Amino acid sequence: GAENSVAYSNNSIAIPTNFTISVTTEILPVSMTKTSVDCTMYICGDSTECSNLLLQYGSFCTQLNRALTGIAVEQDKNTQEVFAQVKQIYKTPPIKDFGGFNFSQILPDPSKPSKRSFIEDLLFNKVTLADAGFIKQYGDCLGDIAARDLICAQKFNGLTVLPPLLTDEMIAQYTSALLAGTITSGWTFGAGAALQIPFAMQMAYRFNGIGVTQNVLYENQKLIANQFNSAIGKIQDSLSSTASALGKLQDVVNQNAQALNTLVKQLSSNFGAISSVLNDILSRLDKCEAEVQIDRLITGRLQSLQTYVTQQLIRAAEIRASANLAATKMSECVLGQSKRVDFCGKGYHLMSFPQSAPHGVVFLHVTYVPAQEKNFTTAPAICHDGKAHFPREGVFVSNGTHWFVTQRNFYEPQIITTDNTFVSGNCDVVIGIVNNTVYDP
Amino acid sequence: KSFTVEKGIYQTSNFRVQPTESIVRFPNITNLCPFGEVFNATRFASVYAWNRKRISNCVADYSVLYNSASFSTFKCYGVSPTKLNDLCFTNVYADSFVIRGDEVRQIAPGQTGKIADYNYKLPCDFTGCVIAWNSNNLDSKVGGNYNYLYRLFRKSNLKPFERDISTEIYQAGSTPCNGVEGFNCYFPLQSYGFQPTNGVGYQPYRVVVLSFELLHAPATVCGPKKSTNLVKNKCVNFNFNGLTGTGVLTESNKKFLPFQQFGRDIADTTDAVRDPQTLEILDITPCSFGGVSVITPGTNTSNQVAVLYQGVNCTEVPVAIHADQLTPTWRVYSTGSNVFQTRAGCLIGAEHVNNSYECDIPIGAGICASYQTSQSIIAYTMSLGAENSVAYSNNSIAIPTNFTISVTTEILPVSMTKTSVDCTMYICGDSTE
Amino acid sequence: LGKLQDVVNQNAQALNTLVKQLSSNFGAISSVLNDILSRLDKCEAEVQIDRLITGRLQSLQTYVTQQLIRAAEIRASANLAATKMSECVLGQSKRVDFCGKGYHLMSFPQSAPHGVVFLHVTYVPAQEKNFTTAPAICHDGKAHFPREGVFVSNGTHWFVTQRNFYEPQIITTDNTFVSGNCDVVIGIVNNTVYDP
Amino acid sequence: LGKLQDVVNQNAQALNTLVKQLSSNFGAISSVLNDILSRLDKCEAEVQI
Ligand SMILES: *[C@@H]1O[C@H](CO)[C@@H](O[C@@H]2O[C@H](CO)[C@@H](O)[C@H](O)[C@H]2NC(C)=O)[C@H](O)[C@H]1NC(C)=O
Ligand SMILES: *[C@@H]1O[C@H](CO)[C@@H](O[C@@H]2O[C@H](CO)[C@@H](O)[C@H](O)[C@H]2NC(C)=O)[C@H](O)[C@H]1NC(C)=O
Ligand SMILES: *[C@@H]1O[C@H](CO)[C@@H](O[C@@H]2O[C@H](CO)[C@@H](O)[C@H](O)[C@H]2NC(C)=O)[C@H](O)[C@H]1NC(C)=O
Ligand SMILES: *[C@@H]1O[C@H](CO)[C@@H](O[C@@H]2O[C@H](CO)[C@@H](O)[C@H](O)[C@H]2NC(C)=O)[C@H](O)[C@H]1NC(C)=O
Ligand SMILES: *[C@@H]1O[C@H](CO)[C@@H](O[C@@H]2O[C@H](CO)[C@@H](O)[C@H](O)[C@H]2NC(C)=O)[C@H](O)[C@H]1NC(C)=O
Ligand SMILES: CCCCC/C=C\C/C=C/CCCCCCCC(=O)O
Ligand SMILES: *[C@@H]1O[C@H](CO)[C@@H](O)[C@H](O)[C@H]1NC(C)=O
Ligand SMILES: *[C@@H]1O[C@H](CO)[C@@H](O)[C@H](O)[C@H]1NC(C)=O
Ligand SMILES: *[C@@H]1O[C@H](CO)[C@@H](O)[C@H](O)[C@H]1NC(C)=O
Ligand SMILES: *[C@@H]1O[C@H](CO)[C@@H](O)[C@H](O)[C@H]1NC(C)=O
Ligand SMILES: *[C@@H]1O[C@H](CO)[C@@H](O)[C@H](O)[C@H]1NC(C)=O
Ligand SMILES: *[C@@H]1O[C@H](CO)[C@@H](O)[C@H](O)[C@H]1NC(C)=O
Ligand SMILES: *[C@@H]1O[C@H](CO)[C@@H](O)[C@H](O)[C@H]1NC(C)=O
Ligand SMILES: *[C@@H]1O[C@H](CO)[C@@H](O)[C@H](O)[C@H]1NC(C)=O
Ligand SMILES: *[C@@H]1O[C@H](CO)[C@@H](O)[C@H](O)[C@H]1NC(C)=O
Ligand SMILES: *[C@@H]1O[C@H](CO)[C@@H](O)[C@H](O)[C@H]1NC(C)=O
Ligand SMILES: *[C@@H]1O[C@H](CO)[C@@H](O)[C@H](O)[C@H]1NC(C)=O
Fold first, then answer.
1. Quick count: other Cβ atoms within 10 Å of Cβ B31?
2. Alpha carbon distance A227, A220 (integer Å)
3. Are A197 and A206 in contact (CB under 8 A)?
4. Top mutation candidate among A10, A428, A435 for ligand 9, by most atoms within 8 Å of CB
5. DSSP label at B116?
6. What CA–CA distance (Å, rounded) separates C27 from C35?
7. How far apart are CA A324 and CA A330, in angstroms?
8. Cβ atoms of B136 and B203 closer than 8 Å
9. Nearest chain C residue (CA) to D27
10. Ligand 1 probe mutation, A216, A217, A223, most atoms within 8 A of CB
């Protein structure tokens, strides 16, 4: 990266005088495809003799089905714990009098039949084969036999994709509830019932939270609002242009589809048998050698299924980790203001907004970034009349002529007074103290 | 694999359907095969000049051979002999010759000796079968037949199914003898002496090797079975050109090349067949369509259930499930009054309810089911929760005046059982071997 | 205590599945080593027993793999429990909904078979009242903002109140602070500020 | 720095176990492909391999 050398000195401080309000998009997978498998059909193409031979294994694919059902239940659990943080389905007021902040892009659009917002619509467009499962209805596999779609081969070999419990509309409704609570009630709708608060005052709370006084909001409200709106516009273009915006989700989709395709391809292996087709074996050999060849094939295909289930358990563990992270982010950044650094964006965290996405969630972290800075001459304390003065909040600063106190993250100089500072002992122990006079009102 | 099922929705294996009928469809050919020419021949060829005969447009009855001919050895590789009636053979060649009795063992894959290296070699990956019978009363005369010759010397062993009828003098020694006989170079072909009185191992044996390959090409030599009709749109035990399987056969649209009869998908199972009689194309599908999930309150509560079929259209459920092949206890669940078409699929056995409750048994796609009391199973779109609309205004604030001190229990697992395994005892029950 | 009982059940079920999987032939003539070793001589006993050994070793490998998955999950839960004990028992956590629904006061641990139980004691504001608010107060041309709390009105007079409890107190110099003139802030109202 | 050295050891041990597991017969006549391919003709070489 760019080599840099900060101009550190023992009495020089860089204080900001201006800021920016950034909006950072960041995307977490939450769930994956609730795959299910019929062991009998996959291993044996509904032939009686192979089924009879598979009968004496029995416990193996009982275990496999148990594992896959656990995975599916875990996926539903993941989605619920991420999105169903609350249960009171709040709705936005008809009036969007939010102090100049424009939420139309993220709030629901009632014109569309589905209540996805604009950004959620873009996100659902960016991921290609999200569903590719339960949507595929029979008859298409018998009507469009010419195309030879992968899903049809998966269905004919017992590999099905179960539908998620929460539909996209229901998840979007949860998201709308979270948004409405965030932008009307502040953080209080997580800690018990939802209160109400004017949005500008909620913003003032957040600014007071990140250690800058509330007044600079009121003094720069319109500007801040404009900045926020512009940031949203930048998101509305940034994820609209490129195609790899939602890579992390599309990769998950691809892994699941690829795994199923590898399984139906692995059906083509001999596994040491005379042929990979049960029908050839059962039409070319009498009972006993058919038993032994079919046993070889059964063991091989059961091994392939066990491999698939093991990889699915690995991937489900990873998705559960990501879903736990998403739940923590929704709890700590949507439902409240997080003091943890770089947990919810690059900069001091103001708020976050959730947006649904296919098999995942998207957080728009709105954050405060100090932008323009000025050098100043500082000193850790002030000696007035033999006693030392230290600031309660802020640091001592000088423009070259006079000294003031300033809050850490914004240049708001104000004259030295008794109430700005406090006194602790004589001024002959502290290093770097300077002389000045302290106004007493 | 237990009686007491608990409350929930379970994915269950497709045992409901059972086949009921068999279909045999063999080509309309009736010419009995030339058994007379390759078995009842006046004279066979010498082993070094073994005679190859194409065979096509046959019906391999081979019960006619039971009447007269008795075969000392009849070994079949790649096919179990009991199945030879249930098959159609594509590229059938008969390789006929005569040897002595002791060398009949050399007509087999992976053998070595005079016959297996210098005269007649079979490949390792040999599909086909070998017949040999003693012929002392035909191919041996007093004084000894010398019409049967074998190649005694060769510089290198033969490749499979390779003939070598050269008669150049074999230079055994290191001095070339320029095309004449004498010392240290011999005439390679030596004549069997088949007296009618010598031992069994020096008695002439006639051998025919039938070489063919199976279930990959248009088969012209068919078995002696009797064809039946074609039952489509119903899952049957089909036997097409010996390819024996079970499934539903339907019409299709594939541009098969003239030299192809079987089509295979990515899984390599056969999917497209060409009917031998009427040169059309058929597609084979399974008759367990796929997911059939069963929804139930757990036993110790009741014994009623519902059934979801994933992805089917509620109109076409009975044909995809093949309800006509099922018992009435299944046909009640195939279709009834309690039809519901979810985007997850078709649900039968529970009445749809326009209300919305926080739900017990999830089904999918926003649908849940529960066993309510009207003591049956209901299905509904699950309720997200209480709709609310906070009364936001730009100068109104809700401040609390009182509080509560709640205590919330929440439970985390920390450890699990420290299991240990002795591999030797588990795998081997303390047996030494 | 479902979450613990499920763990117990998974471990027991896994072991039961293993001893049940001992009953499989794995392509051998029988699933019993004694039958094989009493019906066959050396060489075919070797090959049948090798088939059985490979099958049972595969079953054991499957068991160990599933145990590793489950142990990873338990380690994740144990790391979460350690973090909760550190951040909520040993201290007061500001993270929202980490240690109960509401503002976190404390937590108490309790042991349990193969797990831990946290009693999170938390503060939940219960009864609320509407009020007319304003972000600031213009006294004599300058704007007044509260240090801690928000400006509130019951309809007649204005007070400052801490965020999470209605404790109104009269406007004074020490309750508020001044920043510039009162012609830039939106929503400011007029009132008088007591000076002691 | 045990926690890191253990990771290193696990990776090295895993690779060593793999190259040691190359020495198993797995029910074949021998664990060496060269022995199998020099003692048997095509078909039984196919099945052993
Ligand atoms: C702080 O930064 C903002 C820009 O991020 C400045 O606002 C812009 O100022 C220029 C000229 O004054 C205008 O042309 C722009 O229209 C303003 N941007 C917006 C979004 O309104 C602002 O002037 C800076 N404040 C200080 C004290 O320097
Ligand atoms: C919030 O931002 C949008 C711009 O993205 C403002 O303009 C709307 O843009 C959309 C799509 O371009 C149109 O469907 C709307 O008709 C536009 N609004 C109007 C009044 O025409 C939108 O106005 C902004 N919201 C507010 C309250 O100002
Ligand atoms: C700050 O002010 C005090 C007194 O005004 C200074 O203290 C004197 O410094 C001179 C420097 O030589 C000494 O000669 C005196 O003896 C000191 N008198 C006392 C009472 O301390 C002090 O030096 C000043 N410090 C700075 C950084 O300006
Ligand atoms: C096929 O014909 C070739 C050529 O005659 C044979 O290869 C030669 O065999 C002789 C005797 O072993 C050698 O002296 C030559 O060096 C070989 N020439 C080449 C180019 O290989 C070959 O042995 C014959 N194949 C069979 C199965 O008989
Ligand atoms: C708060 O008080 C000030 C002065 O008492 C008001 O300012 C005057 O408002 C009237 C309204 O028409 C104007 O005619 C005067 O020109 C204003 N004088 C000055 C010095 O500003 C102010 O309007 C009051 N604001 C509220 C919300 O009550
Ligand atoms: C001196 C005795 C032999 C010493 C060498 C021992 C073993 C290796 C040679 C093995 C071949 C044995 C003779 C087989 C002859 C061909 C038989 C046939 O194909 O018809
Ligand atoms: C502060 O001083 C250093 C060196 O004098 C200089 O490099 C730096 O640019 C100054 N900071 C700003 C914001 O100008
Ligand atoms: C520094 O601050 C004082 C305070 O009034 C001001 O008078 C002076 O002009 C300022 N000087 C510079 C260089 O900013
Ligand atoms: C700060 O650094 C300078 C030289 O780099 C030194 O002269 C000065 O004494 C230092 N300030 C203090 C309080 O020590
Ligand atoms: C065979 O021959 C006739 C004429 O090609 C054809 O119509 C018939 O369907 C075929 N099958 C049988 C059993 O005759
Ligand atoms: C073969 O020959 C014998 C007598 O020569 C005769 O009885 C028999 O029917 C013939 N069998 C065949 C298949 O031609
Ligand atoms: C099971 O049956 C017994 C006796 O009827 C009853 O006490 C118990 O509550 C039942 N438990 C469940 C889960 O149904
Ligand atoms: C099949 O499902 C579709 C819904 O997309 C429906 O329009 C159609 O009517 C159904 N087919 C029949 C025969 O009902
Ligand atoms: C349920 O809602 C549908 C659609 O409005 C309607 O057709 C049906 O009559 C309703 N049934 C009941 C019992 O309310
Ligand atoms: C506050 O005002 C709204 C509408 O005037 C009302 O619905 C709500 O009940 C009020 N809040 C309380 C605690 O009464
Ligand atoms: C509002 O607060 C003032 C402060 O004294 C009080 O006098 C008045 O009675 C209160 N009015 C209402 C409606 O609460
Ligand atoms: C608050 O909303 C009302 C109408 O909804 C509006 O008249 C009023 O001007 C708004 N308050 C401010 C400070 O803009």
1. 9
2. 11
3. no
4. A10
5. I
6. 14
7. 10
8. yes
9. C50
10. A223
